[PDB]
Enzyme design. Structure first.
Site, PDB file in Angstrom:
ATOM      1  N   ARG A 292      17.747   2.665 -45.369  1.00  0.00           N
ATOM      2  CA  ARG A 292      19.042   3.157 -45.939  1.00  0.00           C
ATOM      3  C   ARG A 292      19.400   4.484 -45.251  1.00  0.00           C
ATOM      4  O   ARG A 292      19.237   5.544 -45.828  1.00  0.00           O
ATOM      5  CB  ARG A 292      18.793   3.383 -47.442  1.00  0.00           C
ATOM      6  CG  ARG A 292      18.508   2.049 -48.148  1.00  0.00           C
ATOM      7  CD  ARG A 292      18.232   2.295 -49.633  1.00  0.00           C
ATOM      8  NE  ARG A 292      17.152   3.334 -49.677  1.00  0.00           N
ATOM      9  CZ  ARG A 292      15.875   3.002 -49.752  1.00  0.00           C
ATOM     10  NH1 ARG A 292      15.477   1.761 -49.544  1.00  0.00           N
ATOM     11  NH2 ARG A 292      14.987   3.953 -49.834  1.00  0.00           N
TER      12      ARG A 292
ATOM     13  N   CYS B  62       5.035 -11.754 -46.316  1.00  0.00           N
ATOM     14  CA  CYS B  62       4.485 -10.380 -46.577  1.00  0.00           C
ATOM     15  C   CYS B  62       2.955 -10.374 -46.677  1.00  0.00           C
ATOM     16  O   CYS B  62       2.365 -11.106 -47.451  1.00  0.00           O
ATOM     17  CB  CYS B  62       5.095  -9.965 -47.915  1.00  0.00           C
ATOM     18  SG  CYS B  62       4.623  -8.259 -48.300  1.00  0.00           S
ATOM     19  N   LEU B  63       2.324  -9.523 -45.907  1.00  0.00           N
ATOM     20  CA  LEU B  63       0.834  -9.414 -45.948  1.00  0.00           C
ATOM     21  C   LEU B  63       0.417  -8.452 -47.074  1.00  0.00           C
ATOM     22  O   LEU B  63      -0.718  -8.456 -47.510  1.00  0.00           O
ATOM     23  CB  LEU B  63       0.433  -8.847 -44.581  1.00  0.00           C
ATOM     24  CG  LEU B  63      -0.122  -9.972 -43.701  1.00  0.00           C
ATOM     25  CD1 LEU B  63       0.069  -9.612 -42.226  1.00  0.00           C
ATOM     26  CD2 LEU B  63      -1.615 -10.157 -43.989  1.00  0.00           C
ATOM     27  N   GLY B  64       1.324  -7.618 -47.541  1.00  0.00           N
ATOM     28  CA  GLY B  64       0.973  -6.656 -48.625  1.00  0.00           C
ATOM     29  C   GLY B  64       1.528  -7.129 -49.975  1.00  0.00           C
ATOM     30  O   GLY B  64       1.707  -6.334 -50.880  1.00  0.00           O
TER      31      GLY B  64
ATOM     32  N   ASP C 278       8.361   2.337 -48.820  1.00  0.00           N
ATOM     33  CA  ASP C 278       9.743   1.934 -49.253  1.00  0.00           C
ATOM     34  C   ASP C 278       9.874   0.468 -49.707  1.00  0.00           C
ATOM     35  O   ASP C 278      10.882  -0.170 -49.449  1.00  0.00           O
ATOM     36  CB  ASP C 278      10.612   2.193 -48.021  1.00  0.00           C
ATOM     37  CG  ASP C 278      12.080   2.311 -48.440  1.00  0.00           C
ATOM     38  OD1 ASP C 278      12.361   3.077 -49.345  1.00  0.00           O
ATOM     39  OD2 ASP C 278      12.901   1.633 -47.846  1.00  0.00           O
ATOM     40  N   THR C 279       8.916  -0.060 -50.426  1.00  0.00           N
ATOM     41  CA  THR C 279       9.063  -1.467 -50.934  1.00  0.00           C
ATOM     42  C   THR C 279       8.786  -1.490 -52.441  1.00  0.00           C
ATOM     43  O   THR C 279       9.690  -1.644 -53.241  1.00  0.00           O
ATOM     44  CB  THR C 279       8.054  -2.347 -50.178  1.00  0.00           C
ATOM     45  OG1 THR C 279       6.745  -1.811 -50.301  1.00  0.00           O
ATOM     46  CG2 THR C 279       8.448  -2.445 -48.702  1.00  0.00           C
TER      47      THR C 279
HETATM   48  C1  HEM Z   1       7.881  -5.453 -53.551  1.00  0.00           C
HETATM   49  C2  HEM Z   1       7.250  -5.231 -52.428  1.00  0.00           C
HETATM   50  C3  HEM Z   1       7.447  -5.915 -51.081  1.00  0.00           C
HETATM   51  C4  HEM Z   1       8.438  -6.744 -50.668  1.00  0.00           C
HETATM   52  C5  HEM Z   1       9.626  -7.315 -51.469  1.00  0.00           C
HETATM   53  C6  HEM Z   1       8.146  -7.089 -49.278  1.00  0.00           C
HETATM   54  C7  HEM Z   1       8.939  -7.942 -48.535  1.00  0.00           C
HETATM   55  C8  HEM Z   1       8.598  -8.332 -47.253  1.00  0.00           C
HETATM   56  C9  HEM Z   1       9.355  -9.309 -46.486  1.00  0.00           C
HETATM   57  C10 HEM Z   1      10.651  -9.959 -47.008  1.00  0.00           C
HETATM   58  C11 HEM Z   1       8.737  -9.481 -45.320  1.00  0.00           C
HETATM   59  C12 HEM Z   1       9.156 -10.407 -44.129  1.00  0.00           C
HETATM   60  C13 HEM Z   1      10.139  -9.765 -43.132  1.00  0.00           C
HETATM   61  C14 HEM Z   1      10.668 -10.665 -42.023  1.00  0.00           C
HETATM   62  O1  HEM Z   1      10.383 -11.872 -42.144  1.00  0.00           O
HETATM   63  O2  HEM Z   1      11.379 -10.110 -41.132  1.00  0.00           O
HETATM   64  C15 HEM Z   1       7.572  -8.614 -45.322  1.00  0.00           C
HETATM   65  C16 HEM Z   1       6.648  -8.508 -44.302  1.00  0.00           C
HETATM   66  C17 HEM Z   1       5.599  -7.621 -44.278  1.00  0.00           C
HETATM   67  N1  HEM Z   1       5.271  -6.739 -45.307  1.00  0.00           N
HETATM   68 FE1  HEM Z   1       5.951  -6.779 -47.171  1.00  0.00          FE
HETATM   69  N2  HEM Z   1       7.022  -6.398 -48.825  1.00  0.00           N
HETATM   70  C18 HEM Z   1       6.589  -5.691 -49.940  1.00  0.00           C
HETATM   71  C19 HEM Z   1       5.473  -4.851 -49.952  1.00  0.00           C
HETATM   72  C20 HEM Z   1       4.703  -4.579 -48.854  1.00  0.00           C
HETATM   73  C21 HEM Z   1       3.646  -3.568 -48.804  1.00  0.00           C
HETATM   74  C22 HEM Z   1       3.241  -2.689 -50.012  1.00  0.00           C
HETATM   75  C23 HEM Z   1       3.149  -3.567 -47.561  1.00  0.00           C
HETATM   76  C24 HEM Z   1       2.021  -2.696 -46.984  1.00  0.00           C
HETATM   77  C25 HEM Z   1       2.176  -2.145 -45.770  1.00  0.00           C
HETATM   78  C26 HEM Z   1       3.861  -4.578 -46.798  1.00  0.00           C
HETATM   79  C27 HEM Z   1       3.594  -4.946 -45.494  1.00  0.00           C
HETATM   80  C28 HEM Z   1       4.204  -5.996 -44.823  1.00  0.00           C
HETATM   81  C29 HEM Z   1       3.849  -6.472 -43.498  1.00  0.00           C
HETATM   82  C30 HEM Z   1       2.717  -5.817 -42.665  1.00  0.00           C
HETATM   83  C31 HEM Z   1       4.718  -7.416 -43.146  1.00  0.00           C
HETATM   84  C32 HEM Z   1       4.788  -8.176 -41.809  1.00  0.00           C
HETATM   85  C33 HEM Z   1       4.253  -9.582 -41.653  1.00  0.00           C
HETATM   86  C34 HEM Z   1       4.604 -10.172 -40.294  1.00  0.00           C
HETATM   87  O3  HEM Z   1       5.634  -9.739 -39.748  1.00  0.00           O
HETATM   88  O4  HEM Z   1       3.837 -11.050 -39.870  1.00  0.00           O
HETATM   89  N3  HEM Z   1       4.811  -5.141 -47.610  1.00  0.00           N
HETATM   90  N4  HEM Z   1       7.492  -7.935 -46.527  1.00  0.00           N
HETATM   91  C1  LIG Z   2      11.824  -5.944 -44.090  1.00  0.00           C
HETATM   92  C2  LIG Z   2      10.564  -5.189 -44.526  1.00  0.00           C
HETATM   93  C3  LIG Z   2      10.484  -4.931 -46.040  1.00  0.00           C
HETATM   94  C4  LIG Z   2       9.274  -5.865 -43.977  1.00  0.00           C
HETATM   95  C5  LIG Z   2       8.155  -4.837 -44.207  1.00  0.00           C
HETATM   96  C6  LIG Z   2       8.841  -3.478 -44.165  1.00  0.00           C
HETATM   97  C7  LIG Z   2      10.245  -3.878 -43.712  1.00  0.00           C
HETATM   98  C8  LIG Z   2      11.341  -2.815 -43.869  1.00  0.00           C
HETATM   99  C9  LIG Z   2      10.022  -4.232 -42.234  1.00  0.00           C
HETATM  100  O1  LIG Z   2      10.369  -3.601 -41.246  1.00  0.00           O
HETATM  101  C10 LIG Z   2       9.360  -5.584 -42.478  1.00  0.00           C
END
Ligand code: HEM
Ligand SMILES: CC1(C)[C@@H]2CC[C@@]1(C)C(=O)C2
Ligand code: FES
Lengths: 106, 404
Positions: free
Chosen positions: B176, B347-349, B241-242
Site C-alpha cells: 500500500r 502460501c508456505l506460512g 504485512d499479512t
Molecule cells: C493471513 C495471512 C496470509 C495470507 C492471506 C497469505 C497469502 C498468500 C498468497 C495469496 C500467496 C500466493 C501469492 C501468489 O500466488 O502470487 C502467498 C505466498 C506466500 N506466502 Fe503467504 N500469506 C499469509 C501469511 C504468510 C506469512 C505469515 C508468511 C511468512 C513469511 C508468508 C509467506 C509466504 C511465502 C514464502 C509465499 C510464497 C510461496 C511461493 O511463491 O511459492 N505468508 N501468501
Molecule cells: C502477495 C503476498 C501476500 C505473497 C506473500 C507476501 C506477498 C505480498 C508477496 O509478495 C507474496
C-alpha cells in the site's frame, strides 16, 4: 476408520480418520513424520508421497491427470503403489489401510 | 486512465482501482465485490494503474493460477513497473525451477518452525492481552495486530525489535504505497538491510531463519547470496504485512457481532472452523500474473505481455462458490476460498498464520469476552496488494474481563 503410517526408520503410527478426510490432512494434523503437504492437497506438489500397501491399492480410485504428473517428480523412489496421500479420501471401505512414508518429500 | 489498447473491446472496460476502490467506505471486501454485481462480466479491463485485466469470479481465478504456462509469475504486482522489479524467490518463478526454493522456505516458516515457536506465540499473545485487559480500551492495530505477529517474526529471524518501524515502513510501500517510494526503491532498501546480515550469518551461521536460508541448499546444491537475499526479502514482507492486517478485519467483525462472540465463548473448539470462515469473508490479498503469449480465455482475447489481476479475495466472496457470501457462518459446510493462494505458489506460512489467528481468538475471548467499537468511531479500510484497517479503537468494561 483406521489408517497406519509406517515411517522410513520403521516406526508405526495408527489413527482413526473420519470419512471425507485425506490421508495427508490426517498425517499433518497428527504430526506424522516427513509428510509436508505444502500445496495444501491440490495435487500441485509432491511432498505428500507415500507407498499404499499392495493389499489396498485396488480399493482406492486411481490417480488423476494432475497426480500422475506430480508423481513424476517425487524425490523418493517411485514405486507402482506410490500415491500423493492428499488425493486419497478416507472411507470405511479403506479401514486398516497401511501406507509407508519415504523420509524425503522436498 | 491509460488509453484503451486496441485488442481490448470497449464492452469489457470497468475502471476499478485496486489501490483506492470507489466503494471503500462500505468496506474493502464490499468495494472489490462490486466487480461481481449482475452487470459486470467475468473478465474486465480497467484503465487504472497502467491498465490490466481482472478475473472477477473464482472459476476464472482458480483456472488462471493453475495454468502457469499461460499466466506467469515473473510479473505479479500491478503498476507495470512494480511487477517488473519484483524478484522475491518462491513466487517470481514458474515451477520446473520454483519448486526447489519452497523446501528451504518451509524450513523457516512451515510447521517445523511453528512447533519451535509454539510456546513463545502463546506467551506473547497472553502477555499483550493481559496488559490491555484492565485498560478497558486499546488501539488494536498498534497495540496487538502489529506487535504480536511482527515480534514473533523478528524473534524467528533473529532481528532486533528496534528495526520494526524501519522495516514495517518499507514492506507497506510494496503493498500500500503512499507515494514517497516506488516498489523498486522500497525493495532495494529492504535488500540493503539484509545484505550485510546474510554475509555475517554465512560466515557464522546460527539458528535464526536468515542463517538457515543463507546457508540452506536447494535440491542438493548451496544457495547463492543473491537467492538468499531474494527469499529473505519475501519472508520479511509476509511476516510484517499479512496476519497483521487480517487480525484487525477479524476483531472488527467480532466487536460488531456479539452473537458470534458468544458462539466461540460457548464452544471454543469451533475457533479453528471460525478462523477459516473469517479467512474467506475477510480475505485480503490480490496480486496476479502476466500472459506469456496471445491466448483466448473464456471468450476474451488476451495479448502477450498483458497483466491480469487474479485477486485471491474474490474467489471466496463469489456467490457461485458460497451462497450468501457476505454473511459469516462458522458452521458453513463448504468454506471454499483461495485466501492463501492457489496452484504451485500456495502460501508456505499459512500454518504460522492459522496458529497466530486461532491463538489470538482463543486467548482474547478468554480474558476479554465482551468488547465493542469505540462509540462514534467509523472504521476505515485501505486497499492495495494486501488490504488492511487504518485503525480499530475497541472498548470494554474491565469488570467483565478475567485474568488467567
Ligand atoms: C493471513 C495471512 C496470509 C495470507 C492471506 C497469505 C497469502 C498468500 C498468497 C495469496 C500467496 C500466493 C501469492 C501468489 O500466488 O502470487 C502467498 C505466498 C506466500 N506466502 Fe503467504 N500469506 C499469509 C501469511 C504468510 C506469512 C505469515 C508468511 C511468512 C513469511 C508468508 C509467506 C509466504 C511465502 C514464502 C509465499 C510464497 C510461496 C511461493 O511463491 O511459492 N505468508 N501468501
Ligand atoms: C502477495 C503476498 C501476500 C505473497 C506473500 C507476501 C506477498 C505480498 C508477496 O509478495 C507474496
Ligand atoms: S499436498 Fe501437494 S500434492 Fe499432496
Amino acid at each position: 476408520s483406521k489408517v497406519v503410517y509406517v515411517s522410513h526408520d520403521g516406526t508405526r503410527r495408527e489413527l482413526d480418520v473420519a470419512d471425507g478426510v485425506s490421508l495427508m490432512q490426517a498425517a499433518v494434523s497428527n504430526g506424522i513424520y516427513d509428510i509436508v503437504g505444502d500445496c495444501g492437497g491440490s495435487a500441485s506438489c509432491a511432498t505428500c508421497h507415500v507407498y499404499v500397501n499392495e493389499a489396498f491399492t485396488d480399493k482406492v480410485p486411481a490417480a488423476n491427470e494432475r497426480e500422475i504428473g506430480m508423481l513424476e517428480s517425487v524425490t523418493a523412489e517411485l514405486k507402482p503403489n506410490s500415491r500423493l496421500c492428499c488425493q486419497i479420501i478416507m472411507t470405511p471401505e479403506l479401514d486398516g489401510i497401511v501406507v509407508d512414508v519415504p523420509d524425503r518429500q522436498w | 486512465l491509460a488509453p484503451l489498447p486496441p485488442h481490448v473491446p470497449e464492452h469489457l472496460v470497468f475502471d476499478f482501482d485496486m489501490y483506492n476502490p470507489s466503494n471503500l467506505s462500505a468496506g474493502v471486501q464490499e468495494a472489490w465485490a462490486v466487480l461481481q454485481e449482475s452487470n459486470v462480466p467475468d473478465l474486465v479491463w480497467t484503465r487504472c494503474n497502467g491498465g490490466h485485466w481482472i478475473a472477477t469470479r473464482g472459476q476464472l481465478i482458480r483456472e488462471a493460477y493453475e495454468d502457469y504456462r499461460h499466466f506467469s509469475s515473473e510479473c505479479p504486482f500491478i503498476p507495470r513497473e512494480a511487477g517488473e522489479a519484483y524478484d522475491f524467490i518462491p513466487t517470481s518463478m514458474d515451477p520446473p525451477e520454483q519448486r526447489q526454493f519452497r523446501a528451504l522456505a518451509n524450513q523457516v516458516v512451515g510447521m517445523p518452525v511453528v512447533d519451535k515457536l509454539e510456546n513463545r506465540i502463546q506467551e506473547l499473545a497472553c502477555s499483550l492481552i493481559e496488559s490491555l485487559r484492565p485498560q478497558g480500551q486499546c488501539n488494536f492495530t498498534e497495540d496487538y495486530a502489529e506487535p504480536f505477529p511482527i515480534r514473533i517474526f523478528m524473534l524467528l529471524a533473529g532481528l532486533p525489535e528496534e528495526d520494526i518501524p524501519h522495516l514495517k515502513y518499507l514492506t507497506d510501500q510494496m503493498t500500500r504505497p503512499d507515494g514517497s517510494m516506488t516498489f523498486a526503491e522500497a525493495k532495494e532498501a529492504l535488500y540493503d538491510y539484509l545484505i550485510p546480515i546474510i554475509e555475517q550469518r554465512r560466515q557464522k551461521p546460527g539458528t535464526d531463519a536468515i542463517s538457515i536460508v543463507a546457508n540452506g541448499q536447494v535440491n542438493g546444491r548451496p544457495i547463492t547470496s543473491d537467492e538468499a537475499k531474494r527469499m529473505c526479502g519475501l519472508l520479511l514482507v509476509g511476516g510484517l504485512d499479512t496476519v497483521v492486517n487480517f487480525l484487525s478485519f477479524s476483531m472488527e467483525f467480532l466487536a460488531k457481532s456479539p452473537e458470534h462472540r458468544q458462539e466461540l465463548i460457548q464452544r471454543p473448539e469451533r475457533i479453528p472452523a471460525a478462523c477459516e470462515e473469517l479467512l474467506r469473508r475477510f480475505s485480503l490479498v490480490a496480486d496476479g500474473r502476466i500472459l506469456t503469449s496471445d491466448y483466448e480465455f473464456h471468450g476474451v482475447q488476451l495479448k502477450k505481455g498483458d497483466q491480469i489481476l487474479l485477486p485471491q479475495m474474490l474467489s471466496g466472496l463469489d456467490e457461485r462458490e458460497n451462497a450468501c457470501p457476505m454473511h459469516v457462518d462458522f458452521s458453513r459446510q463448504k468454506v471454499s476460498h483461495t485466501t492463501f493462494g492457489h496452484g504451485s505458489h500456495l502460501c508456505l506460512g499459512q500454518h504460522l498464520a492459522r496458529r497466530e489467528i486461532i491463538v489470538t481468538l482463543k486467548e482474547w475471548l478468554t480474558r476479554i469476552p465482551d468488547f465493542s467499537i469505540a462509540p462514534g468511531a467509523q472504521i476505515q479500510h485501505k486497499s492495495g496488494i494486501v488490504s488492511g484497517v487504518q485503525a480499530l479503537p475497541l472498548v470494554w468494561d474491565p469488570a467483565t474481563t478475567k485474568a488467567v
